[PDB]
């Protein structure tokens, strides 16, 4: 099974998933020098007033959250998006050192971690059908930097022990995505893919420029999660990030001047 180790990491994914070498792979390094302001980008719209989180889980790859996507309670519109995209999940890629952890990089700089909020184009009926489409998903990436504690993350941090091993999950109805959003919504957008197998190129990436802060203690708790299952030898869930992939001449657009 795929992973992040020497024998099953990103260097191996292409064998089982040949698209790993596609023309629209994620993540990419955001080169501010080549990125270009796109005046035709409409204002980003994040409607997260209605709560929809159902539970937190450990799938042996990364910490994640599943949200109730039965209705248009938490959606993403505007920016480069055509239509309405419904929030279905969130995943956290984390490093083993504060100097690394993010999938996307800005001018080669890596952050301690990167949080993703996955949305699907409601024109496709459901998540499953959406991921088979070039414009089926819209993913909001948020960089995490070490510093002040992030209030909207403490509730999760206190119950991480309950989902320490893969296959574990806990009910969690108050994971408010509004509480992990930065002050500014400035972002870079580019056509890409999922950052883990199946690596489908069905994603419109919206990476927020401004990172949020989280305390050392909060990061340390997420670094205590396990890639392994219960009773199995311990493998800390750290460095579960894919390195920057070939841009292949794709165009990264900025929402700001």
From Swiss-Prot:
Pfam families associated with the record: Carb_anhydrase
Site described as Involved in the binding of some activators, including histamine and L-histidine, located at 89
Which residues are named in the active-site annotation?
61 (proton donor/acceptor)
Listed result of changing residue 61 to W: Impaired activity, rescued by 4-methylimidazole (4-MI). Impaired activity, not rescued by 4-methylimidazole (4-MI)
The UniProt keywords, alphabetically, are:
Acetylation, Cell membrane, Cytoplasm, Disease variant, Lyase, Membrane, Metal-binding, Osteopetrosis, Phosphoprotein, Zinc
What detail does the entry give on cofactor binding?
A: Zinc. Can also use cobalt(II) with lower efficiency, but not copper(II), nickel(II) and manganese(II).
Q: What is the effect of changing residue 91 to C/D/E/N/Q?
A: Strongly reduced CO(2) hydrase and p-nitrophenyl acetate esterase activities, impaired stability of zinc binding
Enzyme Commission numbers on file: 4.2.1.1, 4.2.1.69
Q: Mutating residue 4 to H has which effect?
A: Reduced proton transfer rate
- How would you classify this enzyme at the top EC level? lyase
The similarity annotation says: Belongs to the alpha-carbonic anhydrase family.
List the protein's name. Carbonic anhydrase 2
Lineage, opening ranks: Eukaryota, Metazoa, Chordata, Craniata, Vertebrata
């Amino acid at each position: 099974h795929w992973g992040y180790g020497k024998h099953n990491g990103p260097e191996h994914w292409h064998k089982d998933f040949p698209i790993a070498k596609g023309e629209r792979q994620s993540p990419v390094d955001i080169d501010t020098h080549t990125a270009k302001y796109d005046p035709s980008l409409k204002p980003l719209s994040v409607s997260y007033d209605q709560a929809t989180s159902l539970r937190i889980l450990n799938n042996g790859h990364a910490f994640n959250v599943e949200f109730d996507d039965s209705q248009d309670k938490a959606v993403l519109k505007g920016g480069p998006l055509d239509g309405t995209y419904r929030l279905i999940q969130s995943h956290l890629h984390m490093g083993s050192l504060d100097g690394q952890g993010s999938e996307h990089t800005v001018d080669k700089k890596k952050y301690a971690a990167e949080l993703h909020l996955v949305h699907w184009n409601t024109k496709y009926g459901d998540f499953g059908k959406a991921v088979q489409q070039p414009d089926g998903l819209a993913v909001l990436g948020i960089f995490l930097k070490v510093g002040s504690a992030k209030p909207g993350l403490q509730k999760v941090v206190d119950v991480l022990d309950s989902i320490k091993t893969k296959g574990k999950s806990a009910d969690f109805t108050n994971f408010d995505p509004r509480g992990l959003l930065p002050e500014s919504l400035d972002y870079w957008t580019y056509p890409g893919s999922l950052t883990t197998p199946p690596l489908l190129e069905c994603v419109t990436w919206i990476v927020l420029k401004e990172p949020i802060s989280v305390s050392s203690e909060q990061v340390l708790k997420f670094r205590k999660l396990n890639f392994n299952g219960e009773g199995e030898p311990e493998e800390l869930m750290v460095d579960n990030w894919r390195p920057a992939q070939p841009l292949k001449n794709r165009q990264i657009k900025a929402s700001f001047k």
